[PDB]
Structure 1
Amino acid sequence: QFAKPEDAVKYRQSALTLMASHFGRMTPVVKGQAPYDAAQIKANVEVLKTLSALPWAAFGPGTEGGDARPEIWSDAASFKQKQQAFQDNIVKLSAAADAGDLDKLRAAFGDVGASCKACHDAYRKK
């Protein structure tokens, strides 16, 4: 859906910005600094689930640019590992949010965050 590589870059940066906001806005809740409303978090994690499937299709071959490392493309199966592990941790976060279980939520949130960091460290330019 992208006329030029720059359009893919702009899309994935926006998608990642929006994932990051829907993830990070739960940090006060996980920490107990903001109240836990199970319905609120269930709805937010449903939004995060949708968003977390979006960036990856905008790293199609030849879309080097932005802060993406070239190894995303040359190591395609490994980059796919990291994205798929991140989404299966999103599945676990959805299960926790759907269950309305704050302890399960905290644990799953931490797993997701670790998976963000793992891909970051390997595939985002310094």
Structure 2
Amino acid sequence: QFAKPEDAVKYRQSALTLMASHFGRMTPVVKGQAPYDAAQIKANVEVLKTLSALPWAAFGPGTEGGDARPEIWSDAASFKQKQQAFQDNIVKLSAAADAGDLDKLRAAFGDVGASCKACHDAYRKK
């Protein structure tokens, strides 16, 4: 759905802005600095789940640009792995939010953060 490589870049940086907001806005709740309302978090995590599947389809062949390292494309199986791993971690977050269990949520949340960071360390330009 992208007329030019720039349009895919702009889409994926857009989608990652939204995902980072929907994940990071929960930080105060995971830390106990903000109140935990199960319904409110369940809802926000559903939003995050839909957003978390969107960036990956905007690294199609020929969308080099942005801060994406070229190795996303020369090692596509490994990049595919990292994103499936991250998406599985979002499943576990969903399950914790759907269970309304804050301890489970905080552990899920740390696993999700580690997997964001694992991918950036291999595939996002310093």
Taking structure 2 as the reference length, the TM-score comes to 1.00
In 2: Cα distance, 1:32 partner to 1:43 partner: 19
Cross-structure match for 1:116: 116
After superposition, give the CA deviation of every residue in 1:86-114 in whole Å (9 maximum; x if it has no partner): 00000000000000000000000000000
In 2: Cα distance, 1:79 partner to 1:16 partner: 16
Aligned-pair CA distance for 1:62: 1.2
Give runs of aligned pairs for residues 1-126 of structure 1, distance below 5 A: 1-126=1-126
Equivalent residues, number: 126
In 2: Cα distance, 1:82 partner to 1:40 partner: 29
* Poorly superposed stretches of 4+, deviation over 2 Å: none
After superposition, give the CA deviation of every residue in 1:57-81 in whole Å (9 maximum; x if it has no partner): 0000111000000000000000000
In 2: Cα distance, 1:25 partner to 1:36 partner: 12
After superposition, give the CA deviation of every residue in 1:25-66 in whole Å (9 maximum; x if it has no partner): 000000000000000000000000000000000000111000
